[PDB]
């Protein structure tokens, strides 16, 4: 039902200065914090209105953590380049994905942590939250370092404790936007393609969260091949948009019906032309 | 709040 996720991106840029570290925080599909080492004096910036109520003690602590991670990932980029015997001229990326998933009840459902190198799985925390899965012999060196540092033990305690604890706090402070689902504004349109065939299109706009399913039915069947359903896209104001189109024989555009499924709507909604 | 343990790979 609810989740907190942190996204890290460490990119090396030889000849273009020191490596760039970007840290982004999320509560479901809503971004609430951002950090960029690129600035003259980098600091954690609010990205949601419900996180602005946090005291200066919160912001200075978050800035201290991400400043430490900036330096950590600079050494990690240097070490991983050595493990793969890579050139000092090439640009490489270390990505990290970690967080805690909360059930409909409000309890820890699943804790997770994953790290990548150049868009490839590198090291990941197992489902037991006690062991690591290394992708290769290079990731094994990282695993041994992380085992000696007791990363898995302190990460488990964070994911079971503070992660859940702060996610619950954020959900309460922003209950008017995070715990409130926005239903899609549905409407179908006019569109011809040939003299014998036309194109019916179903529109879904201004919905939150991004999870939605748009299907076309010629008297109840599914047309997976013959449905150009476009990928869910952000509107720009924290809402989303999606559409589905069908190749239709002119005259038969009345036995075609669109089914929209979202958590904003109480039960599936059906609309025609 | 993010994870407060920064470990070099």
């Amino acid at each position, epitope marked *: 039902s609810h989740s907190m996720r942190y996204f890290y991106t460490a990119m090396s840029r030889p000849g273009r200065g020191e490596p760039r570290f970007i840290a982004v925080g999320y509560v479901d599909d809503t971004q609430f914090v951002r950090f960029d080492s690129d600035a003259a004096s980098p600091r954690t910036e609010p990205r949601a209105p419900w996180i602005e109520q946090e005291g200066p003690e919160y912001w200075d602590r978050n800035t*201290q953590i991400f400043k430490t991670n900036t*330096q950590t990932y*600079r050494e990690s980029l240097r070490n991983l380049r050595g493990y793969y015997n890579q050139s000092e001229a090439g640009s490489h990326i270390i990505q990290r994905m970690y967080g805690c998933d909360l059930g409909p009840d409000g309890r820890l459902l699943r804790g997770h942590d994953q790290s990548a190198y150049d868009g490839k799985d590198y090291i990941a925390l197992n489902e037991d939250l006690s062991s690591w899965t290394a992708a290769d012999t290079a990731a094994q060196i990282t695993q041994r*370092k*992380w085992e000696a540092a007791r990363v898995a033990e*302190q990460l488990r305690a964070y994911l079971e404790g503070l992660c859940v604890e702060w996610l619950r706090r954020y959900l309460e402070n922003g209950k008017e936007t995070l715990q409130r689902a926005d239903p899609p504004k549905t409407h179908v349109t006019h569109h011809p393609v040939s003299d014998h065939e036309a194109t019916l299109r179903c529109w879904a706009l201004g919905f939150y969260p991004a999870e939605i399913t748009l299907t076309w039915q010629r008297d109840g069947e599914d047309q997976t091949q013959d449905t150009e359903l476009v990928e869910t896209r952000p509107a720009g104001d924290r809402t989303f948009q999606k559409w589905a189109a069908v190749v239709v024989p002119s005259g038969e555009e009345q036995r075609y019906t669109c089914h929209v499924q979202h958590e904003g709507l109480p039960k599936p909604l059906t609309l025609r032309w | 709040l993010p994870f*407060e343990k920064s470990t*070099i790979m």
Partner: T-cell receptor
Amino acid sequence: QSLEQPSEVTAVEGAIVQINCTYQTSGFYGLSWYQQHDGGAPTFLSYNALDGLEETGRFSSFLSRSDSYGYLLLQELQMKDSASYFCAVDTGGFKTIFGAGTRLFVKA
Amino acid sequence: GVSQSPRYKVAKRGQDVALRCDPISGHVSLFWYQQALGQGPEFLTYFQNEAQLDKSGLPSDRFFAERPEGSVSTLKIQRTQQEDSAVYLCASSPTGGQETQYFGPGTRLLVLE
């Protein structure tokens, strides 16, 4: 952010001794123990991140996060064990808080 | 192990004192601590490679800590005062914070009039 441990503790040679530690902090990441001789380097004994017992030879350390309590147990006490024992708390990041220390006196 | 020099240092009020720390090779993290009689080490400054990530524990700007090559670290105390009299311990961790710390034998500093 602070932590409390007894000032002194005394035990006979060959016996066992317990050094208690309670911590008072906003965040918790780990509880560790260090041995320090007069004008010497503090040397690591054991680290507790999760609840339970850590065993390393004659020395063991327990931790209860819910009770914000931990202790160090030293078995088969020797004359060389007469030193200062410090419990350290990790609260996230890198800043470690150390206690005043417990001076152990091993009676010969 | 971690080494420190000098073991003992007696200084006159107003003098500049230089403290050296040679950590274990490859250890990314470096810590500086102050230790008063009958007390535990109190945090001064933290280094990850050559970058000084925090110095909130330093008593004043007179305390200048550096690690330019990301290995050997120096703590220079400008215009030493009697209040600076303490044991200055240095520690290192292999890959970051919240880890096992490896300490040096320290420097027992005494500042007199």
